[PDB]
């Protein structure tokens, strides 16, 4: 019936002044735009059809044509920025926001989806959707005692659209927008649908990606324990944004980092052996921002047995993960006590550390040499530089620190030098 029309035929029927004729052409349009292979987005734009689709959104007494046009505009806006811009320039934003009030759940769902595709283009379209007043009627759709009485697919669409309103920096979303969305967002973060949880953690991870005062708005709402719970999900599409959000919060103040520790987060990090390389990476990254904190927080790292896990990740891991581990160690050795640094050496940090001095990356080597000297400072404070110096010797670390005098980078070669003449003379 409406299967593969030409864009010429669609134009003829939409330009008829026959609402039923237009309904059929609009659906032929939607079917074109929703095929797997190369939907003709540009052909439809160039045919001039976008303003007619937007106008069809208003046709209250023909909800089928509202539905078809909304579907069609959704898919045009799912494309390139210029394609999405074509939909906005057609006046679709006030029109989709009106549709949020539809009595038909499949219409409003399609309205939700398109606003998501528009807000996803970036900060300006995001902010522009908010300025047109999308938030109030979006949250209204979720004003029910129990989310569980809403349709599954309907719920996941809203959550996704709500994360895109939380997304992108330069600038971050309006603060009042964030405060208006955050409570409902906390409610989705406790819903039991795996896809809703994933999309909510993404949103929370965006909101915590920025200045400490952004992080503070999230921590203030008490979401951290539930982030820690989701940090231990079996479902890796959940673990991934939960970890990113946790990693974001610990870049804040020590008090904010302390609330991650207080919620039990360190118990899940034995993350550091996850089969998925990026989880291992982001977990080590988080660990380096926790060893950068206070001595009592370093001590909490020690007490959870996490130091043997950093030795492990230093010994064998993807090299990007190892580079974070070297950062974690240098931070630990910068802020830790003598006892804590001594503990590090007893756990076997020395050998895996020396072997990465063979790396090409210049920052990892200056980070590693940094760590060594903090560790030699501790050995002096104990009258014990000698024994450590021999450990570095026996496993062939001296060879490395020697050869690092040849290094082109200036901070490198003066670093190794200082080490050899101060403790290897």
């Amino acid at each position: 019936g409406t299967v593969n029309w030409s864009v010429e035929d669609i134009v003829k029927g939409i330009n008829s002044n026959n609402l039923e004729s237009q309904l059929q052409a609009t659906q032929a349009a939607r079917k074109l735009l929703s095929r797997e292979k190369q939907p003709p987005i540009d052909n439809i734009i160039r045919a001039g059809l976008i303003p007619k689709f937007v106008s069809f959104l208003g046709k209250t007494d023909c909800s089928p044509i509202q539905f078809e046009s909304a579907w069609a505009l959704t898919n045009i806006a799912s494309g390139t920025s210029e394609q999405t811009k074509a939909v906005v320039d057609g006046g679709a934003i006030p029109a989709f926001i009106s549709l949020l009030a539809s009595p038909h759940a499949h219409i409003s769902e399609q309205a939700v989806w398109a606003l998501g595709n528009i807000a996803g283009d970036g900060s300006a379209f995001r902010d522009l959707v908010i300025k047109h007043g999308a938030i109030d009627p979006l949250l209204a759709l979720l004003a029910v005692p129990d989310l569980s009485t809403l349709a599954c697919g309907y719920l996941r669409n809203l959550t996704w659209t709500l994360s895109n309103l939380c997304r992108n920096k330069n600038p971050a979303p309006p603060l009042d927008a964030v405060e208006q969305i955050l409570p409902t967002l906390v409610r989705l973060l406790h819903h039991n649908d795996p896809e809703v949880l994933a999309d909510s953690c993404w949103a929370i991870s965006y909101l915590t990606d920025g200045p400490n005062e952004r992080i503070e708005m999230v921590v203030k709402k008490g979401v951290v324990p539930q982030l820690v719970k989701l940090l231990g999900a079996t479902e890796l599409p959940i673990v991934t944004p939960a970890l990113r959000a946790i990693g974001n919060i610990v870049t804040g103040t020590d008090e904010q980092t302390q609330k991650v520790i207080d919620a039990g987060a360190l118990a899940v990090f034995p993350l550091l052996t996850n089969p998925k390389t990026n989880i291992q990476k982001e977990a080590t990254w988080t660990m380096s921002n926790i060893t950068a904190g206070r001595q009592d927080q370093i001590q909490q790292v020690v007490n959870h047995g996490l130091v043997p896990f950093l030795v492990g990740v230093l010994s064998k891991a993807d090299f990007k993960t190892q580079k974070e581990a070297a950062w974690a160690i240098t931070n630990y050795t910068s802020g830790g006590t003598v006892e804590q640094i001594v503990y590090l050496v007893h756990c076997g940090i020395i050998e895996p550390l020396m072997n990465l001095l063979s790396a090409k990356d210049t920052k990892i080597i200056q980070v590693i040499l940094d760590a060594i000297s903090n560790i030699f400072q501790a050995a002096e404070k104990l009258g014990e530089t000698e024994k450590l110096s021999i450990m570095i010797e026996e496993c062939g670390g001296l060879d490395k620190i020697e050869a690092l005098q040849r290094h082109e980078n200036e901070s490198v070669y003066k670093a190794s030098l200082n080490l050899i003449e101060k403790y290897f003379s």
């Binding site: 797997e36 579907w71 799912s78 595709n117 994360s163």
Partner: peptide
């Protein structure tokens, strides 16, 4: 997180 999404129903 997907940035935009095309519907295929």
């Amino acid at each position: 997180n997907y940035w935009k999404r095309r519907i295929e129903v």
